[PDB]
Amino acid sequence: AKRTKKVGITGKYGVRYGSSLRRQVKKLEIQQHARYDCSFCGKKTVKRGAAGIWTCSCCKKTVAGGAYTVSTAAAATVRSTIRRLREMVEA
Amino acid sequence: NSQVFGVARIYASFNDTFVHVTDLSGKETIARVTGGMKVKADRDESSPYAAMLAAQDVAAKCKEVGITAVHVKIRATGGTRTKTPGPGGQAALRALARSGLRIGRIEDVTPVPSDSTRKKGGRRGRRL
Amino acid sequence: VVDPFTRKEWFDIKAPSTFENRNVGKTLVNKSTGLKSASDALKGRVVEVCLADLQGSEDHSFRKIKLRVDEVQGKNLLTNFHGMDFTTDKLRSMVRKWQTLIEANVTVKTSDDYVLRIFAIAFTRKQANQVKRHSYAQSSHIRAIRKVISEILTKEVQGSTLAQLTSKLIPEVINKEIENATKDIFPLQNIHVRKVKLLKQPKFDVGALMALHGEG
Amino acid sequence: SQESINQKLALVIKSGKYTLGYKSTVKSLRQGKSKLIIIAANTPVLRKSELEYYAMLSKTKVYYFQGGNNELGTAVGKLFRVGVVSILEAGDSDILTTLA
Amino acid sequence: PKKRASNGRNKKGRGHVKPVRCVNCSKSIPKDKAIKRMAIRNIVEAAAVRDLSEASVYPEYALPKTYNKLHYCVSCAIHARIVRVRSREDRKNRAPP
Amino acid sequence: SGRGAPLAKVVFRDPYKYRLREEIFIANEGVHTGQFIYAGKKASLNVGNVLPLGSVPEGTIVSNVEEKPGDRGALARASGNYVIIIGHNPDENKTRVRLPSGAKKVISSDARGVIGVIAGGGRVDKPLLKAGRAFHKYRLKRNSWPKTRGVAMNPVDHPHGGGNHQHIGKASTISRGAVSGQKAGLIAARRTGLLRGS
Amino acid sequence: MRAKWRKKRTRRLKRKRRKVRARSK
RNA sequence: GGUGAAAUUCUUGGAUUUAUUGAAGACUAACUACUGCGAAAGCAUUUGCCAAGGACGUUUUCAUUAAUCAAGAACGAAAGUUAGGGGAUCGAAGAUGAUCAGAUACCGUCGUAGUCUUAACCAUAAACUAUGCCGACUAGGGAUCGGGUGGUGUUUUUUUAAUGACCCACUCGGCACCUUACGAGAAAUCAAAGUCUUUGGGUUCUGGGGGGAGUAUGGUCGCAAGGCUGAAACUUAAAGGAAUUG
Numbered sequence A: 001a002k003r004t005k006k007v008g009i010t011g012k013y014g015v016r017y018g019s020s021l022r023r024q025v026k027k028l029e030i031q032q033h034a035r036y037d038c039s040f041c042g043k044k045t046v047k048r049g050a051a052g053i054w055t056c057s058c059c060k061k062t063v064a065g066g067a068y069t070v071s072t073a074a075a076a077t078v079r080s081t082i083r084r085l086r087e088m089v090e091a
Numbered sequence B: 001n002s003q004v005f006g007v008a009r010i011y012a013s014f015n016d017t018f019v020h021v022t023d024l025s026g027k028e029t030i031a032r033v034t035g036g037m038k039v040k041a042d043r044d045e046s047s048p049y050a051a052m053l054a055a056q057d058v059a060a061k062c063k064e065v066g067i068t069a070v071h072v073k074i075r076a077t078g079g080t081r082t083k084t085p086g087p088g089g090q091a092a093l094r095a096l097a098r099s100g101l102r103i104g105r106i107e108d109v110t111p112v113p114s115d116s117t118r119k120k121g122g123r124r125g126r127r128l
Numbered sequence C: 001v002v003d004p005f006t007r008k009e010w011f012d013i014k015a016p017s018t019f020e021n022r023n024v025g026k027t028l029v030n031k032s033t034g035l036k037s038a039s040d041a042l043k044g045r046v047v048e049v050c051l052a053d054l055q056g057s058e059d060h061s062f063r064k065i066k067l068r069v070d071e072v073q074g075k076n077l078l079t080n081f082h083g084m085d086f087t088t089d090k091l092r093s094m095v096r097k098w099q100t101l102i103e104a105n106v107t108v109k110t111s112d113d114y115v116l117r118i119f120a121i122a123f124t125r126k127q128a129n130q131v132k133r134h135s136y137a138q139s140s141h142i143r144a145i146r147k148v149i150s151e152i153l154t155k156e157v158q159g160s161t162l163a164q165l166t167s168k169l170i171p172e173v174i175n176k177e178i179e180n181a182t183k184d185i186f187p188l189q190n191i192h193v194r195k196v197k198l199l200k201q202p203k204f205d206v207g208a209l210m211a212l213h214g215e216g
Numbered sequence D: 001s002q003e004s005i006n007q008k009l010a011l012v013i014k015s016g017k018y019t020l021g022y023k024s025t026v027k028s029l030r031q032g033k034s035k036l037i038i039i040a041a042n043t044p045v046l047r048k049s050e051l052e053y054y055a056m057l058s059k060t061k062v063y064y065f066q067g068g069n070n071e072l073g074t075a076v077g078k079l080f081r082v083g084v085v086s087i088l089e090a091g092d093s094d095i096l097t098t099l100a
Numbered sequence E: 001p002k003k004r005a006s007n008g009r010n011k012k013g014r015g016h017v018k019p020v021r022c023v024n025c026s027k028s029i030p031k032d033k034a035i036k037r038m039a040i041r042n043i044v045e046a047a048a049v050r051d052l053s054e055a056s057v058y059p060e061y062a063l064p065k066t067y068n069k070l071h072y073c074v075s076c077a078i079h080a081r082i083v084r085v086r087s088r089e090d091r092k093n094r095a096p097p
Numbered sequence F: 001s002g003r004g005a006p007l008a009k010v011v012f013r014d015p016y017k018y019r020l021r022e023e024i025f026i027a028n029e030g031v032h033t034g035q036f037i038y039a040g041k042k043a044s045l046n047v048g049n050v051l052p053l054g055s056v057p058e059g060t061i062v063s064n065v066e067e068k069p070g071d072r073g074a075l076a077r078a079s080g081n082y083v084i085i086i087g088h089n090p091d092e093n094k095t096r097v098r099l100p101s102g103a104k105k106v107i108s109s110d111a112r113g114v115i116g117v118i119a120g121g122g123r124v125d126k127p128l129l130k131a132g133r134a135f136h137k138y139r140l141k142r143n144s145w146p147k148t149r150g151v152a153m154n155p156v157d158h159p160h161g162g163g164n165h166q167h168i169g170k171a172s173t174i175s176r177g178a179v180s181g182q183k184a185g186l187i188a189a190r191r192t193g194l195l196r197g198s
Numbered sequence G: 001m002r003a004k005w006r007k008k009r010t011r012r013l014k015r016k017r018r019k020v021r022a023r024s025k
Numbered sequence H: 001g002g003u004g005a006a007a008u009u010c011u012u013g014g015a016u017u018u019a020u021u022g023a024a025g026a027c028u029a030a031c032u033a034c035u036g037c038g039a040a041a042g043c044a045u046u047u048g049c050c051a052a053g054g055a056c057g058u059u060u061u062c063a064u065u066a067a068u069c070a071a072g073a074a075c076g077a078a079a080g081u082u083a084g085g086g087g088a089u090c091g092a093a094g095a096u097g098a099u100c101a102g103a104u105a106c107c108g109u110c111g112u113a114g115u116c117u118u119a120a121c122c123a124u125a126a127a128c129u130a131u132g133c134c135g136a137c138u139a140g141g142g143a144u145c146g147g148g149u150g151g152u153g154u155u156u157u158u159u160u161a162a163u164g165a166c167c168c169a170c171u172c173g174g175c176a177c178c179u180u181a182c183g184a185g186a187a188a189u190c191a192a193a194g195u196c197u198u199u200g201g202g203u204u205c206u207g208g209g210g211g212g213a214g215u216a217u218g219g220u221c222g223c224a225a226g227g228c229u230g231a232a233a234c235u236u237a238a239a240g241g242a243a244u245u246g
């Protein structure tokens, strides 16, 4: 029961739109649909809806996220520089 | 002792020589003259006689501003660059004795990275 | 045609009193007239003189010290301790092949609330009857050595302020505790304090600034 | 050379008795049968302080785990995850005196 | 056919040495290769040392030195004759001149 | 709706009366329901907090930042945007900051901004993929879509609208001093064509 | 001609030969 | 600024040079060696964590469980590919300035992709020691890395006794090196490239004149660039290796 080979989730799109576009969608499509780790309750309950917001299906806490994934990579590289330049000012 | 003091920072490129005198904290400069002034070449901007003809015209204002004695600071281009002093740099330091300015406390400021950025010229080299 | 130097007001430079010779030389500044006076770019300046010139004993010849101007008082400017370099020639002259070069530092804040990270440099030597051509140290030596190099580098900068270490490094008190400590591991020629870098500073207060100046 | 924690916990795991989780730990706290409690780093400060106050009452040593409840549950060698651990007997391990 | 048993210069049991840039060509070359002659100079040289020690303060003073280690690629090092060509058995000798 | 940058609703207690006062903030990516937002010059440096700009060290990144004090925010409101403080001033309460467009602008150190970079992530990476996906995009925004090409209209409808082939026929770069009704195409255009400028 | 450049030369030949054969659908 | 000389370009909106403070990205100097580690590719700032590996020590344990391998699999420099992050430097394409009979270049200024990272591909390098793995056997010599054993050897303190470092002798296990040819080879050379017409310890892979040609075709893998597999017709007396003298 292997079903598709390449497309997977984007088999829904059939022959339409072109490979690269269809292919680029699958990436983010899988990101946004994935379940993530609650930094609070500690389960993989974090799901999306309404891009930018992410909640826990059990502990009911909602985190402002990236659009299609929970951590903007550039935004974690922010939290660092924020934490860094804070620890310089308070030390 | 007396000897009103200044800091004479000499930078010798293979293509030119910098002779620069300031006060102790490096802010206010006294006079700076280089080989590209005292000759018409583009070849001789680094000339040993150039950099010697430089310290000369410095010294007239050095005693005139009131810097009687001067430290000495020498560097090549450094960083990713040649690191080896130019031709006129040593014919400058000496020509500072033709002034009457009193030298002291020599030291070398050539910038020497901790293993820096990639070098110019591209691998297979500079080929001629 | 113009000449900036007409109008140039000359100033006298006062070192800290944790040193010996306090007369550095005559710095100059542009005049104090209206629109941006001459206490503006005087105050913040940073000077570097040789420790042989400060203490008068030339035994210190290879140690440069950064001296930060803090206050300007009555045509007489006052400074404090900023940083300490090793110059170049000496530092490179201590680097010889066929031996281990050790480096260390640690960040430590002092009691006067100066956050500091101060560097140490060591080496290793043949001892006496050694026929072994090179001096190299085992890595599991260089580890705990550099550790206690910093553990000693901590407790000295930590317990006291900057005014004490300004006079602690002059005799090289710290270096001797490193040869006293690391005697038991490897021979270790040429222990020093190569650089101290002044990161965080308090502000003004002129009670540690005048615990310095006015006496010399 | 150093036992970290989880070695000490692995010995606690099969030597003497223990219980796992908020409810059961409160029992042990209310019975004074608890020598130590370990609290996972991600447990909510409400439970953290409710456990801290419960514990200081009966005077039980308190330790804050460095990991979340996910790694702590595997630190007791259990397959599920646990937010707080109560040590009913040290058995053949220490943890009670040493370095904590 | 093999000219040398160091082949250009010594590796002998490693896979790589992070190559170094030439101080003349900028030509790249492995650190295990690449002729390196440490060069220390007097800060003054010439007859400068005389009237310089004259012109200075401090008693008698002392003279600093510039410290540079230059790395050379073959093509440059041979042209600039840091190193020359030797004979079949002359090349063999590794003793420094 | 029609905003791709989630909103965070922050309650506050009214200083001068006993009531609750709700605020609408743009969530900063890592702001989360239940967290405590701190607001003022004495406030700490943490994601979600709003601070004066001179009150942060340079290098600090911030969003929803006011162009002048107390206008309640302008710059970097969009999903995924931030502005970095590049320096401060002793004189006249000035910071200086680099805006997302890249141009640096010098504003008042008393002006505010919230610590972080707005949520909503990489939203524009995902291809629209369909006409309908762009249809609902603008159904909730404004009706600019779809767009009929001026070169496709008749001369009455657009300067481009000259026909018999499809071509613009005169320079597609219009002046700045041009008049309303002549301005279509590349408007102030400094230069034109493919750049590749990193 | 250089070994390497004979390689690049036929690597271009095989591309053009694939392309002409492609017109046979 | 820049070269052999120049020009390009930067500049009295103060250029290069000077100082104070700040930002981003790379890199990890000197130490650095015919020294280390890893299956290779490779790996070079400090501390912590997570697991790993050799050699050694051993009067533990198991007791043939092993050796080498078609298939199949893990990893695999660099460039390169798809996406975001990044973008300091260097820098294909390119743009130029010079150079030459020409100069699509070498040299000079700028500079796109690249270079950096994350996720995913790609699976090629003179990926070289151009030298399969296991086991035995045959020769002297000093340096050295790690471990162990013996030194009533040595040096620094306050038992000048104690953990160290140094010296010396022995012994495994390493990265190399030197001399000799015992042998071997076409030679260059080689402690293996010896123990080969006195031709067999075990085992894996490849080659069979030069071309044509790594071409054509089929298959297969890849997003693609490409990789893997891989002919024949026909053509030709040389091609080639090492060494010698010119």
Ligand SMILES: NC[C@@H]1O[C@H](O[C@H]2[C@@H](O)[C@H](O[C@@H]3[C@@H](O)[C@H](N)C[C@H](N)[C@H]3O[C@H]3O[C@H](CO)[C@@H](O)[C@H](O)[C@H]3N)O[C@@H]2CO)[C@H](N)[C@@H](O)[C@@H]1O
Pocket: F101, F124, F125, F126
């Ligand atoms: N898909 C995510 C990213 O989108 C951007 O790519 C898009 C833009 O960069 C580019 O320009 C589009 C313009 O065509 C379109 N008609 C309007 C859009 N605002 C523009 O974007 C442009 O302007 C915005 C501000 O408006 C700038 O912030 C941005 O830097 C600039 N590229 O058009 C691209 C799409 O056709 C990133 N540049 C690209 O690297 C990446 O694909």
Ligand SMILES: NC[C@@H]1O[C@H](O[C@H]2[C@@H](O)[C@H](O[C@@H]3[C@@H](O)[C@H](N)C[C@H](N)[C@H]3O[C@H]3O[C@H](CO)[C@@H](O)[C@H](O)[C@H]3N)O[C@@H]2CO)[C@H](N)[C@@H](O)[C@@H]1O
Pocket: C132, H142, H144, H145
């Ligand atoms: N696998 C190493 C073997 O060492 C053997 O023995 C060597 C050494 O083990 C032995 O010891 C020598 C000593 O003789 C000589 N007079 C002084 C030398 N330092 C010693 O070497 C010793 O110290 C050095 C460091 O100094 C260490 O690197 C080495 O491991 C150690 N054995 O001396 C030999 C060298 O002259 C044989 N040379 C040979 O079988 C092989 O090389």
Ligand SMILES: [Mg+2]
Pocket: A079, A083
């Ligand atoms: Mg934080």
Ligand SMILES: [Mg+2]
Pocket: B014, B015, B016, B042, B043, B044, B045, B046
């Ligand atoms: Mg020149």
Ligand SMILES: [Mg+2]
Pocket: B036, B037
């Ligand atoms: Mg000129």
Ligand SMILES: [Mg+2]
Pocket: B036, B037, B038, B039, B040, B041
């Ligand atoms: Mg001129």
Ligand SMILES: [Mg+2]
Pocket: B128
């Ligand atoms: Mg040549």
Ligand SMILES: [Mg+2]
Pocket: D001
């Ligand atoms: Mg131990």
Ligand SMILES: [Mg+2]
Pocket: none
């Ligand atoms: Mg053990």
Ligand SMILES: [Mg+2]
Pocket: D044, D046, D047
């Ligand atoms: Mg709770």
Ligand SMILES: [Mg+2]
Pocket: E009, E010, E011, E030, E032, E033
């Ligand atoms: Mg090599």
Ligand SMILES: [Mg+2]
Pocket: E015, E016
């Ligand atoms: Mg290699």
Ligand SMILES: [Mg+2]
Pocket: F143, F145, F146
């Ligand atoms: Mg419509």
Ligand SMILES: [Mg+2]
Pocket: F147
């Ligand atoms: Mg359109």
Ligand SMILES: [Mg+2]
Pocket: F147, F148, F149
């Ligand atoms: Mg249209």
Ligand SMILES: [Mg+2]
Pocket: F152, F153, F154, F163
């Ligand atoms: Mg029409």
